[PDB]
Amino acid sequence: ELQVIQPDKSVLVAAGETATLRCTATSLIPVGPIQWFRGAGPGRELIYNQKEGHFPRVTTVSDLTKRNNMDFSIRIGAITPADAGTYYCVKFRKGSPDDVEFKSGAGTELSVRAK
């Protein structure tokens, strides 16, 4: 059974720098997109979506167009204290009306040192 690994429990970064949030998957089956969120509640905030959408602050560490790719780590540029919080890497499987959440990493606590 597929695992989503967030290797880093916490990340400390200076304001204005690039934060690297790491995530790998042990398999690409079952099929379905990876997404990043801040928070794990119902009010959680979408940070990156493999399927669709524009996320200009977000760069991917690896080439996600590589058929082979299993690295879903992201970089968030010009970080501010407003960016701090817990970030979760999430695998969805295909589902009929909607895709459904399948596996999650254990989270990454992003801390920002001001100024």
Partner: protein, 212 residues
């Protein structure tokens, strides 16, 4: 490998289903592609069930078990085409396609072919070959039998071509060319194609005589 039926048929306004087998719901994404002849395919459905904005609401897709299905809800005569299923198989990093399914619309009742005959041109005859052409115009359904006769049944000197179902009237048209030497053309007299079709009670022969 992905497998789909060679053909499917539907009355206009009705709902048609076309399914590919040989995939696996958990290790594939599927798409559907429409092609008229030897022209660029058009993507109808991607990620199993998603429709690009430019594609009519009557096309939908689904998938489960070993199967993927394109549904067309309100078949129109202009949907006459070949429909390909295309998978991405995540287990092997490959992109299998089915052989394609032609959608035949029934719209039409039987329509007998108009049959026409054309003898070789004098122009062609100088060049040292005689081509004889039998035209079957604006008939339905596809199946037809053309036999050539120099009063004797000639075989293996003829080749046929068919249009695709016409986008407006849902007819086919068929040509058969008989190819002979002029030597051969000049020693015989009666040229005829005999056309057998469901819309014809009995066969229609059409003929010329060489000199006339």
């Amino acid at each position: 490998e992905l497998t789909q039926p060679p053909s499917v048929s539907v009355s206009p306004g009705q709902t048609a289903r076309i399914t590919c087998s040989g995939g696996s719901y958990s290790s594939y994404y599927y798409a559907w592609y429409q092609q008229k002849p030897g022209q660029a395919p058009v993507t109808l459905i991607y990620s199993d069930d998603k429709r690009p904005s430019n594609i009519p609401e009557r096309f939908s897709g689904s998938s489960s078990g070993t199967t993927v299905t394109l549904t067309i809800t309100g078949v129109q005569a202009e949907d006459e085409a070949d429909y390909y299923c295309g998978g991405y198989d995540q287990s092997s990093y490959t992109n299998p396609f089915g052989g394609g399914t032609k959608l035949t619309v029934l719209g039409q009742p039987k329509a007998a072919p108009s049959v026409t005959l054309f003898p070789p041109s004098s122009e062609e005859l100088q060049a040292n070959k005689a081509t004889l052409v039998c035209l079957i115009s604006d008939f339905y359904p596809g199946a037809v039998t053309v036999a050539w006769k120099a009063d004797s049944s000639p075989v293996k000197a003829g080749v046929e071509t068919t249009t695709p179902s016409k986008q407006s009237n849902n007819k086919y048209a068929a040509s058969s060319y008989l190819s002979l030497t002029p030597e051969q053309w000049k020693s015989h007299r009666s040229y005829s194609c005999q056309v057998t079709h469901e819309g014809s009670t009995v066969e229609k022969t059409v003929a010329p005589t060489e000199c006339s």
